[PDB]
């Protein structure tokens, strides 16, 4: 599936002072509804092979985060977590959702999704998460050691690596897919970022937001601490952790969430971008989880 084929399936809606593109399998319907949230440096395209296993049984939506995919670029180039959340929250209000929804989320889309869920607890039917932002990072001994990588990307070298050389798209993304993407698939990930410069700013600001304590991002830290406390104590919120083997953050997430209530786990093969290696197994697990929500 080329990018052109995927985005031809998608719609666009005005959101605040911009616009967001999104997949909607059944517009305007209040049936069982699932929202899929990508992270960095992907788009709704990440879910293209997962959704076909879920949409037979549920209305499926998948937005492109602001500045990403086919969503609008912001002239102020401000793509912090709270900026993304402002646009994504307005998107939620613009697409005629039912009262309760299931959130499926990945990477920074789980940061946004966990936070949205924490702030709209009455709307949460269930949460499916994978390679997700489940807690703050204190010591690097619990997590994959990317301390120096984060120091580097927060330095002025990050502007060169990302805005000029597209580091997250051309180096990081293929490094955490087990197979090699076809040229058409790789071009779909490149398309939102083909212009060097501030078009690529979302893929640089996202890693600079990583919730390292004492890392200068106290608003992100408070947000993650808050939803972590809720997720750790929410016995009424069904959760599905999709564990990637070998994964990247998956081993740490398994430990961090081991005492989360009302959580089931399924393991699939993959690295960080597990959707590109096990889309069928992920989609089937989501479909089965939706069935369990009726209990
Ligand atoms: O902000 C982030 N998240 C968000 C996040 C945080 C905690 C969590 O539990 C889940 C998600 N994730 C990353 C990753 C992970 C990854 C991406 C792609 C390939 C290989 C690894 N890698 C980097 C990075 C890696 C090198 C580098 O030079 C600069 C940055 C940043 N990340």
XYZ file of C-alpha atoms and ligand atoms in Angstrom:
327
model
C 0.000 0.000 0.000
C 1.525 3.261 -1.183
C 1.087 6.456 0.752
C -1.182 7.721 -2.024
C -3.502 4.741 -1.571
C -3.624 5.157 2.203
C -4.265 8.887 2.307
C -6.908 8.606 -0.417
C -8.852 6.635 2.217
C -8.492 9.497 4.718
C -10.460 12.655 5.450
C -9.445 16.090 6.639
C -11.166 18.293 9.208
C -10.348 21.819 10.317
C -8.892 21.796 13.836
C -8.341 25.092 15.675
C -6.194 27.237 13.342
C -5.046 24.279 11.209
C -6.306 20.941 9.866
C -5.791 17.260 10.607
C -6.000 14.251 8.320
C -7.483 11.011 9.642
C -8.686 7.579 8.609
C -12.332 6.832 9.464
C -13.723 3.430 8.537
C -17.353 4.465 9.209
C -17.857 8.239 9.554
C -20.427 9.510 12.042
C -21.396 6.120 13.500
C -21.769 5.519 17.239
C -21.046 1.789 17.080
C -18.100 0.294 18.954
C -15.318 2.771 18.138
C -11.509 2.439 18.297
C -8.995 5.285 17.869
C -5.425 4.458 16.813
C -2.645 6.893 17.834
C 0.811 6.762 16.215
C 4.026 8.310 17.581
C 7.399 9.523 16.332
C 8.254 9.642 13.378
C 5.246 7.811 11.946
C 1.647 8.682 10.951
C -1.709 6.925 10.632
C 0.022 4.914 7.875
C 1.597 2.867 10.708
C -1.802 1.255 11.357
C -2.709 0.448 7.739
C -2.207 -3.322 8.150
C -3.568 -3.516 11.714
C -6.897 -1.803 11.099
C -8.220 -4.344 8.488
C -8.403 -6.952 11.289
C -10.336 -4.610 13.591
C -12.684 -2.630 11.351
C -14.961 -5.638 10.546
C -16.105 -5.335 14.174
C -15.581 -1.665 15.073
C -15.470 1.817 13.623
C -11.747 2.632 13.397
C -10.227 6.114 13.367
C -6.552 6.963 12.989
C -5.484 10.620 12.984
C -2.206 12.076 11.827
C -0.816 14.112 14.715
C -0.393 17.811 13.942
C 2.633 18.484 11.725
C 2.791 14.789 10.827
C 1.314 12.626 8.098
C -1.029 14.772 6.016
C -1.966 17.040 8.921
C -1.174 20.737 8.786
C 2.214 22.253 9.501
C 2.210 24.905 12.213
C 3.874 28.232 11.278
C 5.223 28.712 14.813
C 6.999 25.311 14.595
C 5.844 24.531 18.164
C 5.237 20.786 18.549
C 5.715 20.096 22.247
C 3.597 17.456 23.961
C 1.103 20.064 25.144
C 0.870 21.536 21.618
C 0.089 18.106 20.185
C -2.465 17.542 22.925
C -4.233 20.832 22.168
C -4.739 19.867 18.520
C -5.511 16.204 19.219
C -8.107 17.063 21.892
C -9.851 19.384 19.441
C -9.742 16.621 16.826
C -11.506 14.237 19.255
C -14.330 16.806 19.533
C -14.626 17.224 15.753
C -15.282 13.700 14.426
C -18.630 12.711 16.022
C -17.412 10.038 18.440
C -19.650 7.942 20.705
C -19.636 8.392 24.469
C -17.051 5.668 25.167
C -14.100 4.750 22.952
C -11.175 2.340 22.968
C -7.702 3.842 22.504
C -4.954 1.859 20.736
C -1.645 3.662 21.022
C 2.112 3.532 20.404
C 5.140 5.594 21.421
C 4.239 9.276 21.851
C 0.689 8.451 20.746
C 0.427 6.564 24.022
C 1.698 9.601 25.918
C -1.063 11.631 24.304
C -3.611 8.825 24.602
C -2.877 8.004 28.237
C -3.182 11.707 29.086
C -6.416 12.132 27.109
C -7.811 9.079 28.881
C -6.765 10.413 32.307
C -8.552 13.708 31.550
C -11.673 12.043 30.083
C -11.992 8.970 32.278
C -15.752 8.722 31.652
C -15.095 8.201 27.918
C -12.643 5.283 28.262
C -13.855 1.810 27.332
C -10.355 0.314 27.228
C -6.735 1.024 26.340
C -4.391 -1.017 24.138
C -0.769 0.130 24.378
C 2.575 -0.947 22.959
C 6.125 0.462 23.168
C 4.412 3.081 25.260
C 5.264 5.998 27.570
C 4.122 4.342 30.771
C 6.200 6.218 33.388
C 8.909 8.789 33.886
C 12.568 7.813 33.536
C 14.640 8.249 36.687
C 17.680 6.012 36.595
C 18.743 4.695 33.199
C 19.430 1.299 34.812
C 15.778 0.314 34.377
C 15.461 1.478 30.780
C 17.386 0.989 27.551
C 20.452 3.178 27.969
C 19.864 6.054 25.555
C 21.122 8.706 27.988
C 23.863 9.907 25.623
C 21.542 9.739 22.615
C 19.053 12.014 24.375
C 21.836 14.407 25.429
C 22.951 14.534 21.798
C 19.494 15.127 20.331
C 18.758 17.847 22.890
C 21.991 19.613 21.876
C 22.264 21.913 18.867
C 23.460 18.872 16.928
C 19.831 17.730 16.948
C 18.806 20.503 14.561
C 21.456 19.300 12.122
C 20.735 15.582 12.553
C 16.988 15.979 12.194
C 16.079 19.154 10.320
C 18.916 18.757 7.790
C 19.587 14.987 7.684
C 16.176 13.532 8.699
C 17.859 11.261 11.271
C 14.667 9.877 12.780
C 13.203 8.879 9.391
C 16.346 7.659 7.617
C 18.292 6.043 10.490
C 16.125 5.339 13.534
C 12.951 4.103 11.816
C 14.486 1.290 9.679
C 16.764 0.343 12.592
C 13.765 -0.823 14.659
C 11.882 -2.726 11.957
C 12.929 -6.362 11.603
C 12.117 -6.653 7.911
C 13.208 -4.099 5.335
C 10.412 -1.817 4.154
C 9.618 -1.687 0.468
C 10.560 1.559 -1.250
C 6.882 2.553 -1.443
C 6.408 2.008 2.297
C 9.565 3.946 3.140
C 8.430 6.783 0.841
C 5.103 6.961 2.710
C 7.031 7.604 5.929
C 9.257 10.123 4.134
C 6.449 12.106 2.506
C 5.483 14.416 5.445
C 9.177 15.290 5.870
C 10.578 15.505 2.328
C 11.415 19.199 2.792
C 14.505 19.798 4.958
C 13.920 22.414 7.604
C 11.032 23.025 9.992
C 8.803 20.450 8.269
C 10.851 17.936 10.276
C 10.560 19.783 13.588
C 7.991 17.356 15.085
C 10.488 14.487 14.810
C 13.093 16.528 16.740
C 10.813 18.010 19.410
C 9.287 14.634 20.283
C 12.513 13.027 21.611
C 13.399 16.275 23.373
C 10.130 15.812 25.339
C 11.175 12.381 26.706
C 10.141 12.282 30.395
C 13.533 12.175 32.054
C 13.315 13.600 35.563
C 15.440 16.766 35.960
C 15.413 17.046 32.150
C 13.801 20.489 31.885
C 10.355 19.252 30.790
C 8.413 19.484 34.045
C 5.049 19.798 32.309
C 5.558 16.419 30.594
C 6.860 14.931 33.860
C 3.760 16.010 35.804
C 1.469 14.750 33.014
C 3.135 11.316 32.896
C 3.348 10.981 36.684
C -0.369 11.781 36.852
C -1.558 9.284 34.288
C 0.859 6.654 35.603
C -0.709 6.977 39.056
C -4.150 6.566 37.486
C -3.225 3.619 35.255
C -1.598 1.907 38.265
C -4.825 2.199 40.302
C -7.632 2.025 37.694
C -9.223 -1.339 38.413
C -12.202 -0.352 36.238
C -10.217 0.346 33.025
C -9.491 -2.777 30.905
C -5.997 -2.653 29.417
C -4.113 -4.721 26.843
C -0.309 -4.491 26.793
C 1.078 -5.738 23.484
C 4.636 -6.792 24.314
C 7.151 -6.821 21.451
C 9.810 -9.560 21.378
C 12.571 -8.534 21.460
C 11.152 -4.989 21.295
C 12.985 -1.888 22.462
C 11.145 -0.488 25.513
C 8.944 -3.579 25.841
C 11.110 -5.326 28.454
C 11.139 -2.223 30.659
C 7.394 -1.655 30.147
C 6.638 -5.223 31.187
C 8.461 -4.616 34.470
C 7.026 -1.135 35.033
C 3.408 -2.209 34.474
C 3.658 -5.628 36.163
C 1.286 -4.541 38.950
C -1.148 -2.552 36.786
C -4.723 -3.741 37.469
C -7.086 -5.070 34.805
C -4.248 -5.635 32.305
C -3.733 -8.563 29.965
C -0.596 -9.099 27.896
C -0.023 -10.533 24.425
C 3.467 -10.991 22.961
C 4.224 -10.500 19.257
C 7.462 -10.503 17.309
C 9.001 -7.123 16.591
C 11.300 -4.302 17.612
C 10.012 -0.790 18.400
C 7.868 -0.442 15.255
C 6.180 -3.774 15.907
C 3.245 -2.890 13.618
C 5.512 -3.344 10.600
C 6.414 -6.926 11.514
C 3.332 -8.372 13.259
C 0.313 -6.357 12.056
C -1.976 -9.411 11.840
C -1.180 -10.600 15.366
C -1.644 -7.072 16.738
C -4.948 -6.567 14.919
C -6.270 -9.975 15.970
C -5.330 -9.278 19.597
C -7.192 -5.974 19.471
C -10.272 -7.600 17.935
C -10.331 -10.221 20.690
C -9.828 -7.566 23.379
C -12.814 -5.627 22.024
C -14.885 -8.803 22.451
C -13.824 -9.064 26.098
C -14.929 -5.458 26.715
C -18.542 -6.631 26.565
C -17.969 -8.388 29.940
O 11.409 9.909 22.753
C 11.524 8.766 22.448
N 10.600 7.823 22.624
C 9.296 7.969 23.228
C 9.134 6.894 24.306
C 9.781 7.043 25.527
C 9.622 6.074 26.515
C 8.829 4.962 26.266
O 8.674 3.983 27.250
C 8.193 4.808 25.043
C 8.346 5.773 24.059
N 11.099 6.651 22.128
C 12.339 6.923 21.656
C 13.279 6.058 21.040
C 12.919 4.584 20.840
C 13.399 4.154 19.455
C 12.794 4.666 18.314
C 13.249 4.273 17.062
C 14.287 3.365 16.958
C 14.882 2.849 18.099
C 14.433 3.248 19.350
N 14.446 6.542 20.651
C 14.749 7.833 20.839
C 15.993 8.260 20.379
C 16.912 7.302 19.974
C 18.155 7.672 19.489
C 18.482 9.018 19.395
O 19.733 9.427 18.909
C 17.567 9.982 19.795
C 16.321 9.608 20.283
C 13.819 8.695 21.436
N 12.609 8.190 21.845
